[PDB]
Amino acid sequence: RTRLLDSEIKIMKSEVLRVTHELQAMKDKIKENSEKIKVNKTLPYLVSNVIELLDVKCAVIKTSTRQTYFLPVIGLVDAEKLKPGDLVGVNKDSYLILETLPTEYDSRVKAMEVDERPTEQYSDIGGLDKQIQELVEAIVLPMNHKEKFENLGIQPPKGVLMYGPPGTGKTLLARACAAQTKATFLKLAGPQLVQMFIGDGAKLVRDAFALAKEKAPSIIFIDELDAIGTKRFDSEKAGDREVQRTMLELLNQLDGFQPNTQVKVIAATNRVDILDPALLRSGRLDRKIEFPMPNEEARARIM
Amino acid sequence: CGKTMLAKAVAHHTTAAFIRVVGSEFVQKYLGEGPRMVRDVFRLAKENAPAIIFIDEIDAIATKRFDAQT
Amino acid sequence: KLLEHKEIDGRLKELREQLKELTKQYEKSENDLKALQSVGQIVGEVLKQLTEEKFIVKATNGPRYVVGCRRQLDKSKLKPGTRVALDMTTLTIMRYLPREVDPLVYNMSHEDPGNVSYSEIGGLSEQIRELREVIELPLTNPELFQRVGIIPPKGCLLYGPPGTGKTLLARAVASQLDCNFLKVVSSSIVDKYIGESARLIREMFNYARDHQPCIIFMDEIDAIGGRRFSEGTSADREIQRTLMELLNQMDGFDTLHRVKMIMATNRPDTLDPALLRPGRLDRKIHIDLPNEQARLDILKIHAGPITKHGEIDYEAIVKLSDGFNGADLRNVCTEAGMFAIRADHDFVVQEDFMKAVRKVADSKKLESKLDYKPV
Ligand SMILES: Nc1ncnc2c1ncn2[C@@H]1O[C@H](COP(=O)(O)OP(=O)(O)O)[C@@H](O)[C@H]1O
Ligand SMILES: Nc1ncnc2c1ncn2[C@@H]1O[C@H](COP(=O)(O)OP(=O)(O)O)[C@@H](O)[C@H]1O
Ligand SMILES: Nc1ncnc2c1ncn2[C@@H]1O[C@H](COP(=O)(O)OP(=O)(O)O)[C@@H](O)[C@H]1O
């Protein structure tokens, strides 16, 4: 029975190890949580957009107060978490980053979301079935069927463009898609993008063009492109720069450097002329889609 | 027609203090930086000696049709 | 009898192990705990060095201050315009740093990832070769350029009908070349903060000026492209300067070196005289609508990955296909593809082609004026 008591004596000395660390646990297990709550618990958070992530573990940041402070202790926040333009909790006193924040995104942009979600089915309509197919056929299909397109080696049309009389019925089609396309509906007015501050239109478009890229899939509806859609003259004395650039900005978004098939872009305009000729093309909006004033039966159908 | 060359030539053969300040730099993200510079370039000009202050594209500064409100 | 060593080591191994497992957590976290007291450090450029220790530094976040050095910082290194870490109470140098690049020079620098090489496109080895020589060569084969007595090219500007293959060129170039292409859509550069577009441009050329060689590729300049006035809104004044900011850098006093610039536009009719001029833009690169050859040439490139029974009507499609740009053709494929998917025929043919082609050339009537030459 010696080795029993011999391996027995070990247990308590063995137990010491675990038993003693439970002390060593609480020791830091409390001070860890303790001070962290005091410094972190500080619900005041001055968000600061990172700039340079110098690894010489250093990194500078500019505050929401527009103040640059080189913190030699990135503090709570892994490198990866690190990169420029990235919301950060910064203890007000310390400018020590507490938390990482989600990301920027315009309160003017968020209003482009869709909670109430229309309720217009299709039968609501009438006579528009030609394009209603197209309407579907350019978004729903390419969305709920991306494996079929390549199995024929193709590519899916990049969004559509609605035009025609101003009473035929197009906003319903949007309404129709909005209720149908379970995808995150992105309805936006062409006028809204029209702003004062020399940098709201581009920003908002980017903001809207990003918000969609982070909720795939998405159909962004753009009522009356004319709002932001109009050829660009070339005068001297004065001339629309914003409405142009915003278009440009927008243009540079739809296509241009870096492609994207995560977002569907559907723009109606009571007048498909004023629109500049770098919005139509075929890449920007693939499908030019007429809305002809209806016949009769369709009329009989609407009434 | 060769004005920016003319400044390069002068800063070459020159002998005084050629200050190359761009009129597009004067306006910063601050409410006084501009005058603070001009008082500097002009202050520095006095100190240096017969100095050439040169402003390439004064348009960025002086464009008459101002608009106090924006 | 021998089962005890386990019951000894069993306890031991785990016990002796789980000991450090949980002990290390305190060290790492503690570092995180300790580092807490640790503290921000003001930033600024040295305006100048009053005395060895006396410094005139304009807070990077505001006004100027008289301050001293630290000690082992190197009073010699501290120099005018040098960005330094500064103190939040002592308000002295907390440690000199280098020239940042803002959070915008990364997106156009390390970010914009080009795609396939130049082979991906074509239809006109005209600009492909023409640009390459101006742009690529004057770098790896400029050492002999002086043997002719000619400075490397300055800048190159695409300019063509919307869809001639411009934006696809910048991608092909940065993909193949690879060096330091920083793409500027010339739109997201604009902000609203007096000279917020002056700093972006400065950093762009500064970063590059130091980081050169670098390719500068500006997507749509018609923004800052501008043209000046006499005049327009108080807004236009901002752009101009900004529009000029670049112009003064591209030429002015300090002479661009290594760092080259691709100018992008659809419609060059809008641009300022002072920009097109050599010393700023060397030779303009036109990209016309693919020829019947160029079409056919491009047509077999986008429709190449399509299931097509021994009926490919390439000579027919291309034929009817006139005035059709490079995507008007792609669309043609994509269009037919919808006929392809359409009704039901996983395998396309010569039917879902023409239908598209005219269809693709039918709506093309809604595009008045698609050409605009420069000067
Ligand atoms: N096929 C249709 N069936 C029923 N209503 C229609 C139809 N086409 C148009 N409308 C009517 O038009 C209105 C929407 O007009 P809309 O065409 O969206 O204006 P705009 O084209 O200027 O946006 C709806 O109230 C709807 O009742
Ligand atoms: N007579 C000349 N001698 C030398 N260079 C000339 C002459 N005329 C024109 N140039 C060239 O044209 C360019 C003129 O640039 P510049 O007049 O500074 O343009 P900007 O007015 O836009 O600054 C210089 O590169 C210069 O080499
Ligand atoms: N020469 C070409 N070869 C292949 N594809 C082309 C060509 N030209 C245009 N495209 C199609 O259009 C796109 C290029 O459009 P882009 O040249 O950027 O128009 P823009 O000049 O208006 O920016 C490509 O993604 C491709 O699908």
Side-chain angles (χ1 to χ4, degrees), chain A residues 25 29-303, chain B, chain C residues 10 29 34-375:
Chain A
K29 250 294 151 181
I30 297 168
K31 292 176 186 163
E32 290 175 351
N33 288 336
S34 63
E35 292 179 347
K36 253 123 197 193
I37 294 197
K38 331 233 158 152
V39 187
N40 261 60
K41 261 201 179 148
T42 55
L43 277 174
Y45 265 166
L46 165 101
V47 303
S48 45
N49 299 338
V50 202
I51 304 180
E52 64 239 4
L53 227 192
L54 303 146
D55 298 343
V56 301
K57 289 177 193 167
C58 320
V60 182
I61 292 171
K62 178 188 261 132
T63 60
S64 300
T65 59
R66 297 171 176 159
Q67 298 173 337
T68 62
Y69 284 104
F70 171 69
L71 15 102
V73 206
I74 305 190
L76 310 137
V77 279
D78 309 330
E80 289 195 335
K81 295 179 174 71
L82 306 170
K83 62 190 177 173
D86 244 350
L87 307 197
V88 289
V90 184
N91 177 359
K92 285 180 288 140
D93 301 351
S94 178
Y95 294 130
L96 184 141
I97 298 167
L98 295 182
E99 294 179 350
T100 248
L101 297 195
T103 20
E104 308 183 327
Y105 260 161
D106 265 347
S107 220
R108 295 179 267 152
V109 178
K110 301 278 215 186
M112 266 150 232
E113 256 213 75
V114 176
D115 246 330
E116 276 148 24
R117 266 260 156 174
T119 159
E120 256 249 332
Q121 271 157 344
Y122 289 95
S123 161
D124 234 48
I125 309 188
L128 256 192
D129 308 344
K130 296 177 177 172
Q131 302 85 356
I132 290 170
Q133 288 173 342
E134 309 228 290
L135 198 293
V136 171
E137 291 272 298
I139 301 167
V140 175
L141 263 202
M143 168 30 228
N144 279 350
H145 277 326
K146 313 134 146 255
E147 292 214 337
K148 169 198 277 175
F149 283 91
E150 268 173 35
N151 293 347
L152 175 142
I154 73 163
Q155 266 161 12
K158 305 113 139 306
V160 179
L161 175 58
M162 259 90 99
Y163 74 100
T168 27
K170 313 123 101 171
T171 296
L172 301 180
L173 297 171
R175 250 130 96 181
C177 283
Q180 261 54 64
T181 61
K182 270 221 201 143
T184 298
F185 178 53
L186 180 42
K187 64 115 182 159
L188 158 84
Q192 325 191 333
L193 313 178
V194 185
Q195 302 260 331
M196 177 174 101
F197 301 128
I198 177 197
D200 266 308
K203 227 85 208 271
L204 216 62
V205 170
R206 309 216 282 173
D207 301 340
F209 245 24
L211 179 272
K213 185 159 194 195
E214 281 184 14
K215 274 212 192 206
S218 74
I219 284 171
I220 300 170
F221 186 170
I222 298 173
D223 222 345
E224 47 261 7
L225 190 60
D226 33 315
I228 59 201
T230 315
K231 226 174 194 166
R232 319 90 106 310
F233 36 111
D234 168 73
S235 55
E236 218 129 67
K237 279 166 193 180
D240 286 33
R241 271 317 133 82
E242 249 271 358
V243 209
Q244 266 118 296
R245 304 194 218 183
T246 50
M247 162 231 228
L248 271 183
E249 187 71 17
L250 163 62
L251 300 179
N252 169 46
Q253 325 283 271
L254 230 35
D255 255 76
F257 231 84
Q258 308 189 303
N260 59 130
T261 65
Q262 305 193 298
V263 55
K264 276 91 166 250
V265 170
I266 297 171
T269 64
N270 308 89
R271 308 245 267 105
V272 198
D273 256 0
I274 306 188
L275 330 197
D276 237 12
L279 283 197
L280 320 162
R281 262 232 269 104
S282 64
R284 301 289 161 48
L285 334 83
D286 181 66
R287 313 257 300 195
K288 275 83 187 238
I289 299 315
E290 61 175 333
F291 291 150
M293 291 162 77
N295 292 329
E296 267 148 28
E297 295 201 16
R299 299 227 270 284
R301 222 306 102 164
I302 295 173
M303 256 130 133
Chain B
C1 285
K3 319 159 244 143
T4 296
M5 262 212 84
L6 211 42
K8 275 142 196 205
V10 185
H12 182 173
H13 288 304
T14 192
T15 58
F18 207 74
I19 304 165
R20 32 107 114 156
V21 166
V22 185
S24 256
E25 178 158 7
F26 285 174
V27 299
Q28 274 135 148
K29 224 302 227 188
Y30 206 60
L31 341 192
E33 200 128 317
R36 239 119 79 211
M37 299 179 71
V38 174
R39 275 134 169 164
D40 278 349
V41 183
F42 290 142
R43 251 178 281 123
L44 166 81
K46 304 209 152 200
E47 205 270 11
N48 257 20
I52 291 170
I53 296 171
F54 167 110
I55 322 186
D56 209 323
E57 255 125 315
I58 39 188
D59 177 62
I61 293 313
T63 48
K64 58 151 60 138
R65 254 245 222 190
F66 298 112
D67 175 26
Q69 220 272 40
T70 82
Chain C
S29 63
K34 291 175 204 162
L36 269 196
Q37 292 172 151
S38 65
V39 174
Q41 305 186 303
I42 299 286
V43 178
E45 279 185 346
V46 174
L47 293 176
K48 71 170 298 205
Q49 165 192 94
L50 172 54
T51 60
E52 299 182 11
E53 85 154 24
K54 295 173 182 189
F55 296 97
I56 294 152
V57 346
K58 161 197 125 171
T60 56
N61 76 107
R64 261 157 228 152
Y65 296 110
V66 168
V67 311
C69 321
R70 199 154 89 174
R71 283 289 97 145
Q72 301 255 234
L73 229 165
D74 295 6
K75 275 181 187 177
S76 66
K77 278 169 190 184
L78 299 161
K79 282 170 182 172
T82 241
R83 213 230 317 204
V84 294
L86 295 170
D87 180 81
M88 220 181 84
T89 60
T90 300
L91 227 295
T92 61
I93 300 163
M94 236 329 98
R95 176 216 281 77
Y96 77 75
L97 281 133
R99 332 272 301 312
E100 73 333 329
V101 313
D102 258 290
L104 259 273
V105 180
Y106 236 107
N107 296 342
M108 55 229 240
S109 265
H110 310 270
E111 175 65 60
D112 176 66
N115 224 286
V116 201
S117 63
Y118 56 177
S119 71
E120 227 321 88
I121 62 179
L124 29 77
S125 40
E126 301 300 332
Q127 314 87 344
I128 281 159
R129 168 193 94 223
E130 182 179 348
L131 199 86
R132 271 170 167 294
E133 299 104 10
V134 67
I135 301 165
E136 179 173 0
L137 294 184
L139 30 108
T140 58
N141 191 26
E143 325 208 289
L144 327 142
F145 255 120
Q146 300 161 340
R147 202 205 176 185
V148 190
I150 285 138
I151 306 302
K154 274 252 173 166
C156 294
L157 172 62
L158 300 186
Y159 75 90
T164 58
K166 301 180 250 112
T167 307
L168 199 41
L169 225 173
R171 302 151 97 245
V173 176
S175 64
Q176 204 257 334
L177 264 184
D178 285 347
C179 153
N180 214 316
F181 297 93
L182 338 151
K183 296 111 182 266
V184 186
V185 281
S186 212
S187 285
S188 18
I189 300 177
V190 307
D191 260 352
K192 73 234 275 137
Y193 286 119
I194 319 309
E196 166 86 288
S197 278
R199 206 174 32 51
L200 251 193
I201 293 182
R202 272 123 202 234
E203 289 287 320
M204 257 194 280
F205 285 75
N206 273 353
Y207 157 104
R209 281 294 204 61
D210 288 346
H211 260 33
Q212 35 113 279
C214 292
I215 295 309
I216 305 306
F217 178 83
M218 297 154 167
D219 202 27
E220 322 137 297
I221 337 196
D222 306 293
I224 166 51
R227 178 165 225 309
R228 299 243 201 50
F229 289 123
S230 332
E231 223 109 305
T233 352
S234 166
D236 273 345
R237 264 67 96 123
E238 282 187 347
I239 307 313
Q240 327 260 250
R241 345 247 197 43
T242 302
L243 161 281
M244 252 181 302
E245 276 269 314
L246 343 139
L247 303 123
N248 176 31
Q249 312 220 312
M250 270 189 244
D251 217 8
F253 254 36
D254 245 13
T255 168
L256 250 196
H257 261 350
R258 247 155 214 202
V259 179
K260 300 276 198 205
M261 298 197 317
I262 300 175
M263 290 260 193
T265 189
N266 268 338
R267 71 114 38 64
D269 251 15
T270 175
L271 286 196
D272 178 354
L275 174 56
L276 299 182
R277 79 111 193 154
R280 281 171 170 101
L281 289 166
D282 188 42
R283 192 190 34 222
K284 301 90 160 192
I285 288 163
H286 190 142
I287 303 164
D288 253 5
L289 278 182
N291 299 282
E292 208 160 288
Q293 229 184 35
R295 294 192 295 271
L296 170 60
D297 289 340
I298 293 188
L299 171 58
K300 288 173 162 178
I301 297 176
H302 262 137
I306 306 196
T307 79
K308 344 107 136 250
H309 298 288
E311 208 190 67
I312 294 278
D313 184 347
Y314 283 129
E315 188 112 27
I317 299 188
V318 175
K319 200 89 170 73
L320 258 121
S321 319
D322 223 356
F324 282 160
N325 296 109
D328 294 349
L329 302 156
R330 179 214 254 240
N331 199 36
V332 174
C333 298
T334 308
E335 192 40 39
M338 294 300 293
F339 279 114
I341 281 181
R342 258 214 160 21
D344 252 36
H345 290 347
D346 74 342
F347 70 126
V348 195
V349 21
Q350 88 117 244
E351 203 140 90
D352 320 313
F353 257 115
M354 245 145 321
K355 297 175 182 186
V357 181
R358 332 223 211 235
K359 229 180 180 175
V360 176
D362 196 41
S363 35
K364 175 165 307 194
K365 246 197 200 205
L366 286 167
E367 309 167 331
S368 57
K369 184 105 249 140
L370 307 162
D371 32 345
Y372 297 109
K373 198 234 184 176
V375 205

